[PDB]
Design a protein around this nucleic acid. Structure first.
Ligand SMILES: [Mg+2]
Ligand SMILES: [Mg+2]
Ligand SMILES: [Mg+2]
Ligand SMILES: [Mg+2]
Ligand SMILES: [Mg+2]
Ligand SMILES: [Mg+2]
Lengths: 252, 140, 119
RNA sequence: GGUGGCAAUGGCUAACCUUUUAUCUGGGCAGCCGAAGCGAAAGCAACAUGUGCGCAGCCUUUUGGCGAGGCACGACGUAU
RNA sequence: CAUCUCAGUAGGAGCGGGAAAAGAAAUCAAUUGAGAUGCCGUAAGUAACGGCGAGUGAAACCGGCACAGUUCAAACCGAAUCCCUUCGGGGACAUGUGGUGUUGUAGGGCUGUUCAAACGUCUGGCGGUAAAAUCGAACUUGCCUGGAACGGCAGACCAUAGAGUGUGACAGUCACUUAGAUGUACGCCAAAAGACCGGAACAUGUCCCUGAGUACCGUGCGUUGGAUAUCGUGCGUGAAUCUGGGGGGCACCAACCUCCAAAACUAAAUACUCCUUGAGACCGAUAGCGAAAUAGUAGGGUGACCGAACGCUGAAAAGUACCCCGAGAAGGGAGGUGCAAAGUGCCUGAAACCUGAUAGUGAUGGAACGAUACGGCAUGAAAGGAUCUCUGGCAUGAAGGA
RNA sequence: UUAUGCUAUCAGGUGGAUGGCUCGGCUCAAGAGCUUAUGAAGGACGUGCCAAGCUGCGAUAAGCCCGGGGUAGGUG
């Protein structure tokens, strides 16, 4: 329905009627399913080598030799080729031909996306989910927001709209990860601040890009990860008039 | 099976450790043991031995699509709404070869006036169509 | 020059470890003093034997002196004044790292030095 | 089996294209299952409720009444 | 278990490139249509085969990726052609070099008319791709701890750059980078623009030409889903030629539909990984390749061949000066270096096993090495109790009850 | 001072587990893809001031000449 529109100076300069996507009921399980399916589809095959631990010609000694019945080397008494022998193969390892992609029907995936979009209207879900804000949900901005081209201007707008403390929270929450993930490329653990939505590709997708936590996307690139990080809806977001225009029958 | 349910069970739900050896604890591989020692199971599954009948070539055979008179009558308004049918002088002129149906059966009631053209007609379908004042044309 | 497709620690450490010896000249980089940077337009420079440095980190914060030698493979420089003593007593140079020093006087003798610093 | 989306105007797409790097958004009606069965085959082609008993629930004089689903009949399609 | 299956698999011989193979209907359909090939999806575990058991097992229609058609032999002309070269000349060739010509609701030649020139080859380099590489913002600010700040508390900035690595501990602002831009020899690609062979229709007919041990057939065997109706090939037999020939899942006859074999080439869509780059819900030193490579190594076998173990000082060698013992370049003591011995195969440093010390017990004594209750001796700092521990008095007291 | 021993804990030796680190491995994707009688791949022997192994090289032997990039050190 109606929501206040705020300019880059922070003053309400209109009252636009929201489309029917924003008016839907919250369904955690559908969002869960959609996010899990997409994260499963990102994955990448792995597994050991084809003949690992088995390139050998070991034979058993049989009985009467006073020892066990495992295969041994032909010119020694060292066991080989079996899963409980040192250097032997592994029983049931991962396989590169295993297919781990998940399926979700288009109707229920769109329904979960609508449910997640309508969740950003509720102040309670956003507030308890982690963020800090002092604005009137939902936040809607005039279409000149796509014209901003320097990060300083975006920071000025965020400060004037009461959404900069979340950006600072994400900046100072960046912290080193624990475990074997540091050595493989995942050195930090990040935080999610704010999502900016624009109708069409503009310089705003390049200006509000370096700001910590902020993810900027166009209306034709919304999925369930962006709106429910970790399968929890209630992500702070900003829209524009063009983005509101794009969502008359977007996911219905 | 639930592997974690059986950490510390040894046998893992099989009884003795002398079960779960190989193919001899199943009676053979595949549908093996047709009628010596699996005959009762063979008859109950639906794998009884025998050959019965013949087949005609698929070049000549056809599988006709069907539609009953009740179904055709009930959804007639939607048919004219989609522009499939036609409503000249009240009676519905409905052609079945544009839908993709090659025969009209007769289950159900008919009350509206229908002028149905198709290839085949059961006797009861024709009787029900013409007892409602309609007409049927053998479409050629 | 190794783009953002080198975000893996293994690749970065391979690049820094097995580098061609003409790339190890770039790792001898140190910040310039204010006058040097505002008169050459480069925010930094490379350290070469014969110039005066000001140590900024470690046990010798604030001590100045010339650079007495540079080794490419090791990646360390040697400075006047900064020394360590043997058990029997013999003052020895202590190696440092050029990213812990500041250049206050450049040594212009090559002629190609000015072009080498910038462009 | 437990939980869900859609629902006789049914459900789902496959390969592939849009990939802007493997995600993702939007297309893709070829095809598969359901919608009519019986019969070796040629072939033929059914109830869009006719009757009764009655649980839940509701009404009621607390005894009876209505009674979805359930059960038992009757009628019909086809093969012999 | 013998046909069947395993399986045209394992293995062998030959040939061969950046790809290869196939490829422009004597085709598939069904009444009337489609219009080269390859690869993916579906048809479909269907038709078909089978001790009709176990099992094996398609194609066409339809949807996509990518698109491209042509060249000989002969009929007509008869040297009008090709190649080598010392530029003189020489070889091939009438047993046919060259021109025309290439197909089916037939085509071409001979005979006559018309329209004129489509696809393709060459020169051309506008302009792109293009080696090492170059440039690339903003703090090394104050106090505290520390051996040493990238840390805590304050302050100041950058961002089309908050990917990441190095640096005496956690770095957007220290260094290399990153985002974004420049530069590049030899090569490759290629647009305008010029030159080159030339193609498309029509009318006329006792006229001429159109691929042979081939097509088909009998018979044996292999193979196939191929069933009297798959393909191959050993033996034997064996055509016609436009008034012709083949096909339409048993043979023959008739109608209808459809094509022109037995000569040749042909890009793209596809397969793979020695190699180059990138990424990872991958392993983290008995794991991951056999090998974190002085690893196909040490070693073992006459030989074909089998085949290991081994990572880590510290920020900086500052890698123990001088003195005493000792035969000593062994080793020990004292004394130093370092935040800390971390003292050289040196990070941490478990258990089994071995040496010593402490507590209990012990040379009259009976054993699954312990559970429960009561005592002796030893300990009981932290993390456990303070109407708690010990000893008694008083009030109520269930079952039971002298 | 009860010896030879038994049980428990502590200090030390031996040993190399656990933890932390890791220029290595493995899998997937995108590219690129022939070479040799003008003598290849592979092998033997030689080659360093002190040099045994590996790596590179060939009696010009951890190497020689030219053009570009790079700039003050180099000698796997
Ligand atoms: Mg292994
Ligand atoms: Mg060859
Ligand atoms: Mg061919
Ligand atoms: Mg087979
Ligand atoms: Mg950066
Ligand atoms: Mg190993």
């Amino acid at each position: 329905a109606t929501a206040k529109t705020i300019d880059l100076t922070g003053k309400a300069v209109g009252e636009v009627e929201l489309p029917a996507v924003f008016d839907a009921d919250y369904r955690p399980d559908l969002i869960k399913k959609a996010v899990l399916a997409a994260q499963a589809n990102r994955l990448q095959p792995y597994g050991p080598r084809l003949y690992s631990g088995m390139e050998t010609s070991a034979r058993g000694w049989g009985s009467g030799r006073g020892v066990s019945h495992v295969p041994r080397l032909v010119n020694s008494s060292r066991a080989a080729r079996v899963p409980h022998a040192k250097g032997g193969r592994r029983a049931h390892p991962p396989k590169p031909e295993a297919d781990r992609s998940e399926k979700v029907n288009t109707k229920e995936r769109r329904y979960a996306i609508r449910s997640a979009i309508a969740a950003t209207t509720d102040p309670t879900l956003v507030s308890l989910r982690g963020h800090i804000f002092e604005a009137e949900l939902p936040i809607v901005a005039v279409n000149d927001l796509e014209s901003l081209e320097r990060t300083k201007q975006v920071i000025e707008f965020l400060e004037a709209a009461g959404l900069y403390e979340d950006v600072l929270r994400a900046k100072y929450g960046r912290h080193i990860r624990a475990g074997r993930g540091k050595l493989r490329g995942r050195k930090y653990k990040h935080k999610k601040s704010v999502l900016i939505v624009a109708g069409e590709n503009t310089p705003i997708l390049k200006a509000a890009r370096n700001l910590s936590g902020v993810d900027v996307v166009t209306v034709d690139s919304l999925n369930a990860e962006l709106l429910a990080p970790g399968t929890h809806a209630g992500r702070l977001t900003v829209w524009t008039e063009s983005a509101i225009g794009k969502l008359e029958g977007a996911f219905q | 099976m639930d592997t974690k349910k059986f950490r510390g069970s040894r046998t893992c739900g099989g009884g003795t450790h002398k079960n779960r050896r190989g193919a001899g604890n199943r009676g053979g591989r595949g549908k093996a043991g047709g009628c010596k020692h699996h005959f009762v199971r063979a008859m109950m599954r639906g794998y009884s031995y025998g050959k019965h009948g013949f087949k005609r070539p698929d070049e000549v055979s056809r599988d006709v699509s069907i539609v009953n008179v009740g179904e055709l009558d009930e959804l007639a308004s939607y048919l004219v709404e989609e522009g499939l049918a036609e409503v000249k002088d009240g009676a519905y002129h409905i052609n079945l070869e544009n839908l993709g149906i090659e025969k009209v059966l007769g289950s159900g009631r008919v009350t509206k006036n229908l002028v149905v053209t198709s290839e085949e007609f059961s006797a009861s379908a024709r009787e029900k169509i013409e007892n409602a004042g309609g007409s049927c044309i053998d479409a050629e | 020059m190794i783009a953002m497709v080198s975000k893996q620690p293994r690749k970065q450490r391979k690049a820094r470890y097995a580098a061609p010896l003409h790339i190890r000249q770039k790792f001898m980089g140190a910040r310039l003093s204010e006058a040097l940077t505002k008169e050459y337009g480069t925010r930094s420079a490379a350290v070469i034997t014969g110039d005066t440095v000001k140590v900024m980190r470690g046990d010798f914060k604030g001590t100045e002196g010339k650079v007495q030698s540079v080794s490419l493979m090791d990646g360390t420089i040697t400075v006047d004044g900064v020394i360590s003593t043997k058990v029997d007593g013999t003052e020895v140079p202590r190696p440092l790292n050029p990213s812990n020093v500041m250049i206050t006087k450049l040594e212009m003798k090559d002629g190609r030095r000015a072009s080498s610093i910038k462009k």
